[PDB]
Design a protein around this ligand. Structure first.
Ligand SMILES: OC[C@H]1O[C@@H](O)[C@H](O)[C@@H](O)[C@H]1O
Ligand SMILES: OC[C@H]1O[C@@H](O)[C@H](O)[C@@H](O)[C@H]1O
Ligand SMILES: OC[C@H]1O[C@@H](O)[C@H](O)[C@@H](O)[C@H]1O
Ligand SMILES: OC[C@H]1O[C@@H](O)[C@H](O)[C@@H](O)[C@H]1O
Ligand SMILES: OC[C@H]1O[C@@H](O)[C@H](O)[C@@H](O)[C@H]1O
Ligand code: NA
Lengths: 103, 218, 103, 103, 103, 103
């Protein structure tokens, strides 16, 4: 079991860490059919999604996907500093797997 | 009401957010004493002894900033909402207010981030006209509030026990036990005031942070 | 996959973007039968709904309709500046499909 | 579809609008059996309930009853000004159908 | 239907009202097996639980138990003054049935 | 029934108390498959997890695991002081079983 987001990220194929140390610049959320997703951006232009739930996800991830959107929304609203994101780089925009907040 | 106060400060907005607002010098229980604060003399608009001072107009705050912060290539003027952590120093200290022409309003315990409406940048002494708005600010909440009435401050004036004010009106009717252990009770009264004040701000801000909860979905 | 609300909006028929750049002025919520919905307004008079769940929604949108109502309430109570809304304009009031918040 | 709480209210029998333009004075909630409900009051003495879910509710209202209790709890805490309530007046205390917050 | 917490409390056997008019001093929460509960205390030692869900609870109470634990956490974090608690006094710690906050 | 977190911890052979009396330094959460978990740290380096739901959990613990993740995130954002953690110490990082918050 990983002690931190960097070690967690390294357990998966097609991932990478973004060290941001910044608050979220924008938060977008959609209820449109087949685009039930969230998108965040940072002031450096970096854009990330929480993917629409689909066949690439196992059942245990469904509640976690919903939690992640909750976490991004409140991080944005409170101007919480995001330390790092672990993301899948075989999606465009890159898809969030994990987040760490510090500072 | 929606009245604003103003304070020049070299500490930039990112620092203010990280610090939770504009804090008094001794915070990093600190001494809280209005009389001591008001008499304090460097690089900062008065902010010692548990209070943070402001001006009642942008013009006044800018003029004060040019006296103290000239030689800062960049500083800020923070635009601050009125709320009951604020005391009109001249009203509370009366004839013993040490600098009455300054017409200062001072925040007991400093100025929380949510009370900061926004800020102007001052570059080489020149006020930039663009007001940057603070996302941590809450307009309905703070526009419903005003500064504290002087009656809430007389008992916190902080004069030493031997000071004649404690034997004069209005302070005689509000003297802490020992005044007129005096300094001990002044301090504990300030600590109590600040704790009660911060409870209200926490309730407002942290309740807003928890307004996302949907019970049914889980 | 869209990277912003405008491109997301463009994937649907009967939609348009409203650019508000303002906090929500009023929030209305109903539990009345067949009117389980939310309505918001802006100070310019613009009025928007989150639709009652119905035949027009697929199953994947149900949870997202509930999230959107949560988002509007916290946006209202924290005075969050709304940047844009993507809405369906074949409904009265216009029906929210997506929201963006920036700063 | 109604565009505001007054028009929504007029779609139902045994309802009325109360105009409060005031924050909630007290919030009470209960988990006691058959009294799983919320009660609010205003400083003018006005008292309102969110009804215990029962056979008088259709299935689609169950989530909305839960949302309304979330909204009232947090409106109380944030001191949000309640503009109007639409209530059923064939219950004592009057039972909340909808709420509007403004100003 | 009761209009206040005291009258509600009186509808039940083995209950009593505690009048606190104080914020919560400590909040404890557990996910340990068979001890999925919350405990709160006040500054001079008065102590209350939200019980582990059990056979003593009807279905409608299970949902309200989850809500109550959220209410106590929110109240704790916001330093909100608790007015009264209605409790069952045949449990130790006394088991919360209802809470009021004013004002 | 335990009266406090220390009593609670004592009901379990494979748990210990950590006394922190400090706010959370970092909050991490993941939606990655098989690592749907949260991790917190404190400034002294102490690192704790909320475990991925697994075969070692009974059904009554599932909702409590979700609540704990909710609790830690809001505690992190509000800088609430954590008093003690009760953890299972046959896991690395130590796995949270209970939390107490007090000033
Ligand atoms: O769990 C979700 C992940 O599933 C993987 O199979 C995929 O390669 C990633 O892009 C991501 O979608
Ligand atoms: O998914 C929701 C949408 O469904 C469409 O079919 C409808 O035309 C829109 O007005 C909107 O309701
Ligand atoms: O939807 C709930 C409503 O149901 C009605 O039939 C009843 O008359 C109202 O008092 C209210 O309970
Ligand atoms: O509904 C929950 C209640 O159930 C009663 O039977 C019990 O005596 C109370 O202590 C309380 O647990
Ligand atoms: O209830 C959760 C606990 O279950 C035990 O069997 C296990 O040894 C602990 O590490 C913890 O996972
Ligand atoms: Na004000």
């Amino acid at each position: 079991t990983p002690q931190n987001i960097t070690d967690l990220c390294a357990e998966y194929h097609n991932t990478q860490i973004h060290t941001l140390n910044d608050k979220i610049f924008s938060y977008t959320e959609s209820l449109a059919g087949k685009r039930e997703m969230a998108i965040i951006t940072f002031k450096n232009g970096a854009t990330f999604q929480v993917e629409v739930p689909g066949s690439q996800h196992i059942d245990s991830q469904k509640k976690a996907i919903e939690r992640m959107k909750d976490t991004l929304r409140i991080a944005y609203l409170t101007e919480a500093k995001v330390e790092k994101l672990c993301v899948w780089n075989n999606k465009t925009p890159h898809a969030i797997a994990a987040i760490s907040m510090a500072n | 009401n929606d009245d604003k106060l103003y304070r020049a400060d070299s500490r930039p907005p990112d620092e203010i957010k990280q610090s939770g607002g504009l804090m008094p010098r001794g915070q990093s229980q600190m001494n809280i004493n209005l009389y001591d604060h008001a008499r304090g003399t460097t690089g900062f608009v008065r902010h010692d002894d548990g209070y943070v001072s402001t001006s009642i107009s942008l013009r006044s705050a800018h003029l004060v900033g040019q006296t103290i912060l000239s030689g800062h290539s960049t500083y800020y003027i923070y635009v601050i909402a009125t709320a009951p952590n604020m005391f009109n120093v001249n009203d509370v200290l009366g004839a013993y207010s040490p600098h009455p022409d300054e017409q200062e309003v001072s925040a007991l315990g400093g100025i929380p981030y949510s009370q900061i409406y926004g800020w102007y940048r001052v570059h080489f002494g020149v006020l930039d006209e663009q007001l940057h708005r603070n996302r941590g600010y809450r307009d309905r909440y703070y526009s419903n509030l005003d500064i504290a009435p002087a009656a809430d401050g007389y008992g916190l004036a902080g004069f030493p026990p031997e000071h004649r004010a404690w034997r004069e009106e209005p302070w005689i009717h509000h003297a802490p036990p020992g005044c007129g252990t005096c300094d001990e009770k002044t301090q504990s009264l300030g600590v109590k005031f600040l704790d009660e004040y911060q409870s209200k701000v926490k309730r407002q801000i942290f309740s807003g942070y928890q307004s996302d909860i949907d019970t049914h979905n889980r």
